[PDB]
Design a protein around this nucleic acid. Structure first.
Lengths: 40, 143, 63, 196, 77, 125, 67, 49, 219
RNA sequence: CCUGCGGCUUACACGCGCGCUACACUGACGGAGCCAGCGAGUCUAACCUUGGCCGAGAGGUCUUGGUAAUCUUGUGAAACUCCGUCGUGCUGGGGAUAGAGCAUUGUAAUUAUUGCUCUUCAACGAGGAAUUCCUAGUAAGCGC
């Protein structure tokens, strides 16, 4: 039969590992997102 | 200086009106009171099941003196409570419909119950006179 | 064993100890010359009154 | 009515025991026990729990009235506590007709454990160190011990809660250690002096 | 006052009131006991030290002949 | 027109409004006597409205009250606040304002919460 | 029965000796094994005739009658 | 259907058990009249409802 | 992009939070509320008992608060979340699915609650921008040069997932340890009116019985 | 007893957790009194309703009120208050457990779908190691 929406996506060691290495980069090159402080 | 049933107490005037009805004697109570518990949420039968109908009728007359009109749904929900249904959550149920309808027929026999405006229950000159007589008898209850 | 009375002059400060009990300076209500730090546990304040079961016992820093 | 004219002059406690001529026996409880308030019932639910010393603002009788509804089976019941307090006050005025207020104050003054003890962690070596007890702290401890002994009395006994409360109050006024609260105060003093 | 005695091959005490001593048997509950005490014309608050064997055999026969004495079909076990 | 006032009394969610006119010392709440406290243990606080200034101080004032909402315990406190407000109001227009100030001071020192409204309302942490 | 006042005559004598004096309350009228075969807690019910010993104490009710 | 909320229905007569429904949580049912829908959860004490 | 909900206050003032629950929490739901409290900086919480929400939020607004999070549950475990930005800001209503509990697994160190480092990963559409700005304006403005608390939002497959990781700049690369909960977070509505309105401008609702929403992200 | 992640099986001897009910005289049953707010509700359909009616009840009778503050609706709610009954009794606390009858659908209840009634009356005598949350209209308890 068919499906109507996409519910809860199961995570595993591999999905967590993929996001793990990408954030290992994304602080290894120290790029970083923030609120910026307006003067005056 | 003005005698009202509203001045008279709950238990005191309730017993007084119940005895006055017992002093009146004729109310045409239903025969189900030998086996009824007056509600579906009730567990044991009423202890004074003979004067339980009298107490209910006295409370109904007090309500009819206080409020304009009432109904069998209004009387049943007014005289209704929770239930010993087991361990599941108990909501509030109403009172017995046939007992209420019979009691409604039972108070028009003494003239206490009359058809209110657009139907319903009201009091008559005989009912108001009997209520005033019972209240004045209970007005002298201070000894 | 008549326990005397003591009016707290002030709550002694910087009394490092276990949280809940504090040393406070109280002069005895029997005589305003006997004054000592005492270890009070209950919720207390200054200029209050209390019962002192010991005469010359004085509180110290309880780490 | 007649009692309305009677209470119109003197504001007695529920118009059954006089709310005047109350005396505090033990010292260090002045300005720690509220006995200077002329009132009618112990249900003045104004905001007093917000501050620390404002808890002394409510009467110790109203404190015991709050202590009646201290159980899972009764947390939040008001008029049950009020009627039980009236019954206990009548039982006190029957057993000792001086004043329910005066007898209760004598029991409170005679049920006070004058010393306290603390377990110091010591960095891993707990020790028993005798410490003082604050005035409102001692008053609250006595009230709590009394209410707890009264509640523990009505576990397997057909006696009323007011009856067990009056019996414990009589034992505390005598200081006979026939009640749990008086026995607790005696054992607390014994333990505090054991490791003084 | 009477102690336990043989009633429908059971041992039933009489010092307790007339509802609950008339309940301990298989097939009789609280409401059945209350309505048979209503129908046997006995006072609901009596304990069964009194109610001599006349009324005891009367409630025996109201057990074995209940529909004679207005025990309804919707009340049956 | 008649010398009269209308006053209100509020509770946790219960309100109570009473019209107090120049009468004979009566208080009918929903056409019922004022000495008819439902718990009947909460009567000394209920009759404290007639006790804080004396039983004869309102012998020339009639009260017609109506209480609704909230709880039954709240309804009594709302009726007490409404009675205190009506007593203060009739003391100002139907009676002399100096007597109103004196009665306000006396009732305040007895229990301000009868006249003032001290709700159990919260505050930020 | 065999007297219909069984355990309620000598017990009644002891009550008239003791309970008419101090007196007890509706809860302490259960003393001396006031139990079935008579009136366990209904001593206050029969205390209309006897009076002037002590005020009562009613738990389920609320009364204090000098009996 | 046999019981109707607003924007929620209760369904009889399609299935007969519980794990039948539990195989299909996420299927699509379309009304014969023509609105879309799905099934969401199983009632236990009713046997297939 | 900074919005009219944030333009006057984005980097100007650092925010505070309030954590609360719908009505009579289960104990574990309270514990999870404790976790989401201790994860956020400027963390103060308050239990909601018998409170009218217009009164509660309105009273919280004069006292001064930037945002309000409130939770839901289904027989012990939480399922839903919403954020209400106070100055007429947009409430956002999400479905949260999975969790790991610091109580449950191990005591793995400390949530040091330092002004943390922020990560928003794989947001493209303007709705992703709305989510990024709304969530960024809840963290503290001003982590340091080496703030070791990296919070992580990931936006793969419309199920944004958050973790917390703590890193040390070891000899050849950073090394991280897993802390905080791990989530399957998903939105279903945006209303620019604050939740006290109950009827104001809904920005966005997730179409559910639309066929193509099997495939398509962002409606 | 229901229920969210973990064993094994089908075309049942289980490991981690969330709740409710009780373990009785502040109790339990009989009658009296009673204080809410949130909204919801039907046109070519039958909703939400009032009453009278009869049937223990369950349940069936025609009608207006309402397309909405109007009729439910003051949702006369429950805990609450009074007296009555009862004596700590594993009783009348307790109903898990069954059977039977009754309505009541639905095409059928059959797999006690649901609701009444009768009958059956288990454990539960306060729960160790641990254990979470909590500082006022708060914990807690009650209902719509």
């Amino acid at each position: 039969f068919d499906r109507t929406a996409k519910p809860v996506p199961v995570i595993t060691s591999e999905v967590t590992e993929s996001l793990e290495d990408m954030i290992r980069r994304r602080i290894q090159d120290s790029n970083f997102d923030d609120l910026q402080r307006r003067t005056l | 200086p003005g005698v009202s049933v509203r001045d008279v107490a709950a238990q005191d005037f309730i017993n007084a009106y119940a005895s006055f009805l017992q002093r009146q004697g004729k109310l045409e109570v239903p025969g189900y009171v030998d086996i009824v518990k007056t509600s579906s949420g009730n567990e044991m039968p009423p202890q004074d099941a003979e004067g339980w109908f009298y107490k209910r009728a006295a409370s109904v007359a007090r309500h009819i003196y206080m409020r304009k009109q009432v109904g069998v749904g209004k009387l049943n929900k007014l005289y209704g409570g929770a239930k010993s249904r087991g361990v599941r959550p108990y909501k509030h149920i109403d009172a017995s419909g046939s007992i209420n309808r019979k009691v409604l027929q039972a108070l028009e026999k003494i003239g206490i119950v009359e058809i209110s405006p657009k139907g319903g229950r009201r009091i008559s000159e005989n009912g108001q006179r009997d209520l005033d007589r019972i209240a004045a008898q209970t007005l002298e209850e201070d000894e | 064993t008549p326990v005397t009375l003591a009016k707290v002059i002030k709550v002694l400060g910087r009394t490092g100890s276990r949280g809940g009990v504090t040393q406070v300076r109280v002069e005895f209500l029997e005589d305003t010359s006997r004054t000592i730090v005492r270890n009070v546990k209950g919720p207390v304040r200054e200029n209050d009154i209390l019962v002192l079961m010991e005469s010359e016992r004085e509180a110290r820093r309880l780490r | 009515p007649e009692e309305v004219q009677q209470a119109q002059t003197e504001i007695k406690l529920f118009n059954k025991w006089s709310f005047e001529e109350v005396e505090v026996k033990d010292a260090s409880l002045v300005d720690y026990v509220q006995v200077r308030q002329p009132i009618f019932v112990a249900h003045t639910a104004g905001r007093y729990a917000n501050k620390r010393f404002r808890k002394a603002q409510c009467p110790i009788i109203e404190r015991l009235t709050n202590s009646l509804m201290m159980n899972g089976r009764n947390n939040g019941k008001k008029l049950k506590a009020v009627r039980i307090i009236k019954h206990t006050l009548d039982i006190i005025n029957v057993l000792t007709d001086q004043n329910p207020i005066q007898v209760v104050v004598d029991a409170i003054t005679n049920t006070g454990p004058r010393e306290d003890t603390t377990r110091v962690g010591g960095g891993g070596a707990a020790r028993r160190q005798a410490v003082d007890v604050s005035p409102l702290r001692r008053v609250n401890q006595a009230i709590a011990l009394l209410t707890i002994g009264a509640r523990e009395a009505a576990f397997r006994n057909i006696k009323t809660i007011a009856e067990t409360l009056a019996e414990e109050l009589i034992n505390a006024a005598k200081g006979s250690s026939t009640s749990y609260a008086i026995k607790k105060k005696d054992e607390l003093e014994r333990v505090a002096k054991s490791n003084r | 006052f009477q102690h336990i005695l043989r009633l429908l091959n059971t041992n039933v005490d009489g010092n307790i009131k007339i509802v609950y001593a008339l309940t301990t048997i298989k097939g009789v509950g609280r409401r059945y006991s209350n309505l048979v005490c209503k129908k046997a014309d006995v006072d609901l608050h009596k304990r069964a030290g009194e109610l001599t064997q006349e009324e005891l055999e009367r409630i025996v026969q109201i057990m074995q002949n209940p529909t004679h004495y207005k025990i309804p079909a919707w009340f049956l076990n | 027109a008649v010398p009269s006032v209308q006053t209100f009394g509020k509770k946790k969610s219960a309100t109570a409004v009473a019209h107090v006119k120049a009468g004979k010392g009566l208080i009918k709440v929903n056409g019922s006597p004022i000495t008819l406290v439902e718990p009947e243990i909460l009567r000394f606080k209920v009759y404290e409205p007639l006790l804080l200034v004396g039983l004869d101080k309102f012998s020339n004032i009639d009260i017609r009250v109506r209480v609704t909402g909230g709880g039954h315990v709240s309804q009594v406190y709302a009726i007490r606040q409404a009675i205190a407000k009506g007593l203060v109001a009739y003391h100002q227009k139907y009676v002399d304002e100096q007597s109103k100030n004196e009665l306000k001071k006396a009732f305040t020192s007895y229990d301000r919460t009868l006249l003032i409204a001290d709700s159990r309302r919260p505050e930020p942490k | 029965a065999q007297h219909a006042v069984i355990l309620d005559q000598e017990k009644y004598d002891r009550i008239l000796k003791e309970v008419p004096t101090y007196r007890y309350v509706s809860v302490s009228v259960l003393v001396d094994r006031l139990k079935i075969g008579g009136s366990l807690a209904r001593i206050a019910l029969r205390h209309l005739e006897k009076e002037g010993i002590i005020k009562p104490i009613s738990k389920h009710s609320k009364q204090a009658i000098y009996t | 259907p046999y019981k109707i909320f607003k924007n929620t229905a209760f369904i009889k007569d399609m299935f007969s058990s519980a794990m039948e429904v539990a195989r299909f949580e996420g299927a699509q049912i379309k009304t014969v009249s023509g609105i879309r829908g799905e099934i969401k959860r199983a009632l236990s004490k009713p046997e297939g409802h | 992009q900074v919005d009219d909900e944030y333009a006057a206050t984005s980097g100007i003032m650092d925010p505070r939070i309030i954590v609360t629950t719908s009505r009579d929490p289960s104990t574990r739901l309270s514990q999870f509320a404790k976790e989401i409290k201790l994860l956020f900086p400027n963390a103060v919480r308050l239990n909601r008992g018998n409170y009218v929400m217009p009164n509660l939020v309105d009273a919280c607004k004069k006292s001064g608060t930037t945002d309000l999070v409130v939770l839901h549950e289904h027989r012990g475990v939480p399922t839903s979340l919403t954020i209400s930005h106070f100055p007429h800001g947009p409430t956002a209503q999400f479905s949260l699915h999975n969790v790991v509990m610091r109580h449950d697994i191990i005591n793995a160190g400390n949530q040091s609650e330092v002004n943390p480092h922020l990560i928003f990963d794989n947001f493209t559409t303007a709705l992703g921008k709305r989510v990024v700005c709304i969530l960024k304006h809840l963290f503290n403005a001003g982590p340091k040069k080496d703030s070791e608390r990296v919070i992580t939002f990931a936006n793969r497959g419309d199920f944004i997932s958050v973790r917390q990781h703590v890193y040390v700049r070891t000899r050849e690369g950073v090394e991280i340890a897993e802390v905080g909960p791990r989530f399957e977070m998903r939105l279903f509505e945006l209303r620019l009116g604050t939740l006290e309105n109950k009827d104001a401008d809904v920005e966005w609702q997730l179409r559910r019985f639309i066929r193509t929403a099997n495939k398509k992200d962002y409606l």
